[PDB]
Amino acid sequence: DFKPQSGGGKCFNCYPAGVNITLANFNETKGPLCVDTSHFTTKYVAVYVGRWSASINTGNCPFSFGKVNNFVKFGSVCFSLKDGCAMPIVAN
């Protein structure tokens, strides 16, 4: 989620307002959320307006969020909003 700055004194565009980003049932006090079960699915939920948009970058990973659901097999995987290989989200 994010919003434009708004309210009559601000850039509509210079930087998002009210950012909120979450990883489902990741608990920071419990570290990287690992994929234990034989199968997993990766799902994205936009929450944000106007010509604002956002997406996830590959970062350095050899694969992308979502794309991994096309039957890529691994020995193990774990996900975390804290640092593995990075993949930054970019708003535009």
Binding site: P4, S6, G7, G8, G9, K10, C11, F12, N13, C14, V49, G50, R51
Partner: protein, 883 residues
Amino acid sequence: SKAWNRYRLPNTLKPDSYRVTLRPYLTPNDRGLYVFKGSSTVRFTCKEATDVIIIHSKKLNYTLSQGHRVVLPPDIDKTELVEPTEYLVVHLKGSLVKDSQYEMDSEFEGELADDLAGFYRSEYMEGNVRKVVATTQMQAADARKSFPCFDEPAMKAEFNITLIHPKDLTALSNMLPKGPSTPLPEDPNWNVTEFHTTPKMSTYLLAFIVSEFDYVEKQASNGVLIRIWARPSAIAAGHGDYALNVTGPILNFFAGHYDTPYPLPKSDQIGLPDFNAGAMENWGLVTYRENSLLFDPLSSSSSNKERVVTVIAHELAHQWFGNLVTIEWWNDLWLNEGFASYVEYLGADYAEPTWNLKDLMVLNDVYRVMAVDALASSHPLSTPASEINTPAQISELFDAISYSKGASVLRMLSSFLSEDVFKQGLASYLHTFAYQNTIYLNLWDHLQEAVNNRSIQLPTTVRDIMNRWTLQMGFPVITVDTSTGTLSQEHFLLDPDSNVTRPSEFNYVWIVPITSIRDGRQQQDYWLIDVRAQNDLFSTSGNEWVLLNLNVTGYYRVNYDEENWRKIQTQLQRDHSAIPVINRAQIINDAFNLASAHKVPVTLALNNTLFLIEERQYMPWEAALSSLSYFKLMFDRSEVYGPMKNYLKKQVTPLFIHFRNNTNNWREIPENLMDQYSEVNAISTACSNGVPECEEMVSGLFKQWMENPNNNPIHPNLRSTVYCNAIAQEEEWDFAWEQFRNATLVNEADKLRAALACSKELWILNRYLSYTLNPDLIRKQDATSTIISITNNVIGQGLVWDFVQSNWKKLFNDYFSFSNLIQAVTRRFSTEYELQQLEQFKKDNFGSGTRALEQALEKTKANIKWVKENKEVVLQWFTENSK
């Protein structure tokens, strides 16, 4: 006559710094006034030993200090406000010692009237709150009215501005905010903002804005910060996006063109909900109307795009020429606004290079003002500086001549010089006189020097030629006798018998550059420097022909012998692509205007339309329609209107079919703006003249819209035409009426308000007229536009005439714009019937329109004769071409 009897300052005082504080109280006071507190100190140097202070001040309640309005350095004797000249006059007891700097300081209060003059306020509805904005309009005369100053363009000085506003709001001025906004220690409900010192600038260019607008921002590659401000609700819809998209490229264009990087650090643009003019260039805080800065791709036409980009290019052009090098006195005004009026067309060219916009300068300025200057009642450009003194005498300069003739003559200047030499000259001028004041003669000095360094050949000095054009009214019609290539010029007076009152020190002899082409090949430049000359370059034989004034860069009309007109027509019908697009409009409009002067048979002007049967370009269709409007308006009640309509159908029928193919049954617009305009002209003309295809296709679109009230199928470019034509064919009118009552968007409300006048049913129109009196049905400022729209409908003519004959003393004594109203209502008049009725209406009884009534009489007499002179021949011609 004392100094405060005169309307000019003495040159004995030169200011050299300013400070301002302003507190707009946007809430009304107990007595319902809106007031601001202001403080100011100015530092000034005594240029000549003196003992009295003379400074502009208007409509200010001052505060007395030391028993007097101001504090000074010998003592002050007394202080007075000489209202008829707006001077604060402050006698010193001693004499102010020369070559010394002194503060004059004051504190005062003023009114935020909504007068659009000075520090006025504007109010607008946002959501359901009547928001209030404080703004500034300071065109020439009003700058003093916000704070005391030496309010002259030549008296340039440096300003520090400080603002104090309700904490919620934001403040703006020419510079950036010097540090963030701080709560006022007197009351944290107020903020305080200070700005960096302005450069050396003239008082008429300040701006102060306090507002709740919100902005969209870009950083230019040149490093300047550029920033569109508008209503937050408007900006969230992205309506500012287009402005920010174009403003970068244009700025870097001018940075190239003047060889001079942009002088300020920022470039705010602000779109106000209402404004008197369209725009004002206030240095680095450029101000526009909503409808001339914001753009919505979902509702505005391509015409809105070209208006937006054009206006932007103009007001940005002022940011160098005009604001960096300023005019010495208002008598030179034509040099600024006309020059910018030129460059705007080059500016937009850079931003949207696929639209060929440079061509429309011909329609919109050259020919828009040739028809005005072709009168003995015109005036030259360079009036003597002593003639302009009072604010009325300054304000009168902002007219069609000062803009468009200035544009035309400067275009011609840039064309007989090499354009790169004009660039070099202009750049050298701006480099030399930056931050100073100049007269036009300094510009023509710099051009003369650059021409010499390039050694461009000219028959005389540039000063000579441009004074031949600058300071005498009118323009020549050149006359060629191709049988020998003899050449002559004479002053083109549209009424060939009008008495010339104003003399010419050159007896109306110009020097004229004449580019020309022969059989599609460009010939070499020739100069005319006399009433007559001969040159074999214009002699012709056999099938040879000549055309003059290529691309109509030259500001003069052209005439040829009959045989040469036949040759040109033959070429043009054989292959019109051989003759440049602009010149095909030129060769029409010349024929018509010459015909009105009895310098040629009208049959010739009509002949020149013949080739249009296979023309596709926008320009010549536009020029033809614009001339033939006179014929329609004169004959639309006569029998002659019968054949004429059929003729236009024949002419326009193939063109319509072309677009029907080339738009896949109207499913997409052309990609080129000129082609979109040609589309609109095609559909409009062919439909209104009655091709059967329109009564089906436009009706179909409109009924499809009625099936989809929220989901309008009609592309915004077509809207205004299809609306009116569908209305021309009750339930549609009532549908459009309920739409209008529900209409939220002003562009659409206007388009509907026009289209509803296209109805055929007299009871509909009479209802409309009755509603024109109901302030809730139509906003009382706009009733006149409705009356005019109903008047131009041929069925409504007599209705509106009898209506005004009924209501005149009413709406005169209590309404407004009687002038153009009377213009609209009378211009159909063409026989002694209505002449008698009109003179009776005079005798039976006009505000500002009083002289317009005289105008109506005058042209009516001409109309009376003109129809008598031409009807049968025109009729015989059209019936001939009726086939």
